[PDB]
């Protein structure tokens, strides 16, 4: 009986989606300099408060 | 679960700040620092208008209290109209002949931050400006003014036999403000 909650946040259950996309703007510059579309790296974190390295 | 998120327990902080950039433009156009609106939501994904409908919820199975600390700063001058330190009333002589006539007036000082001696000079100056606008042109002399603010102890050099101030001048030392 001691929790503190903010109305814009809520936890997740039972199912969701993960996206694997080959043309994110930040991933192009810092991850895939020597790669091509047949073998590449991508970030599944969709939060722009962080760089792909972070 | 996502590793950058975690829930909160037992205590936190809420900030009430008067100079947020977005709140200035859209909330407080007709307000001042004595009575204003502010947002306690510190998340810039939303405008203050959008934030107004959001809430922060403390668990309803407990009763909560809040410890409050404040910081305040002012710039008030000591002689001003809002605090009634600007004016006073007095009764002076308006006409000589001998028949003498008197009347009440209200006197006004200009605003500023002054020492006590400088304030007393301004009160004397207000009396005299009344004697130059009325008075003087109606036959009163500069020996019947009738209201003065002083600081001296008259009768200091008094003599018990002759009952006069022997030096011929009153002692020119300040003791306490006085009305003559």
């Amino acid at each position: 009986r001691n929790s503190i909650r903010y109305s814009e946040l809520s936890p997740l259950y039972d199912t969701t989606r993960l996206y694997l996309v080959d043309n994110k703007s930040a991933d192009i510059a810092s991850l895939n300099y020597q790669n091509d579309h047949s073998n590449f790296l991508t970030t599944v974190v969709q939060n722009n408060d962080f760089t792909p390295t972070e | 679960r996502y590793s950058e998120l975690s829930p909160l327990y037992d205590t936190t902080r809420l900030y009430l700040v008067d100079n947020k950039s977005a709140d200035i433009a859209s909330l407080n156009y007709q307000n001042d620092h004595s009575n204003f609106l502010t947002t306690v939501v510190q998340n810039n994904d939303f405008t203050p208008t959008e934030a107004s409908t959001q809430t922060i919820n403390f668990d309803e199975r407990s009763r909560w209290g809040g410890q409050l600390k404040t910081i305040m700063h002012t710039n008030m001058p000591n002689v001003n109209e809002y605090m009634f330190s600007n004016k006073f009333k007095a009764r002076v002589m308006v006409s000589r002949k001998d028949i003498l006539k008197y009347e009440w007036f209200e006197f006004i000082l200009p605003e500023g931050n002054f020492s006590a001696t400088m304030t007393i000079d301004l009160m004397n100056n207000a009396i005299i400006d009344n004697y130059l606008e009325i008075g003087r042109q109606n036959g009163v002399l500069e020996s019947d003014i009738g209201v003065k603010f002083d600081t001296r102890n008259f009768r200091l050099g008094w003599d018990p036999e002759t009952k006069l101030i022997m030096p011929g001048v009153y002692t020119y030392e300040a003791f306490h403000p006085d009305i003559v």
């Binding site: - | 919820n57 909560w64 305040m72």
Partner: protein
């Protein structure tokens, strides 16, 4: 108040009654000093809206135009059950 140790304002130099008063050897002037205050703990509402009103008034319940900085900080905690 602060203490220190030390002609339109003299129109009747000759007159012993109307001479300009002597100045005190102690002079006082008024100062504004920032105030930091702890007000203790007060009961809090269970649901807090995102926009809040802050007000400062005098003894006659007028707002004061000479305030130019005011901040508040609140620290919630549990007082009792239910």
């Amino acid at each position: 108040s602060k203490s220190f140790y030390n002609h339109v304002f003299n129109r009747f130099p000759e007159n012993q009654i109307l001479i300009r008063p002597p100045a005190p050897t102690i002079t006082t002037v008024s100062e504004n000093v920032p105030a930091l205050t702890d007000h203790g703990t007060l009961p809090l509402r269970s649901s807090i809206r995102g926009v809040q009103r802050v007000t400062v008034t005098d003894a006659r319940r007028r707002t004061c135009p000479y305030v130019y900085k005011a901040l508040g900080i609140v620290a919630p905690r549990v007082l009792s059950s239910r």
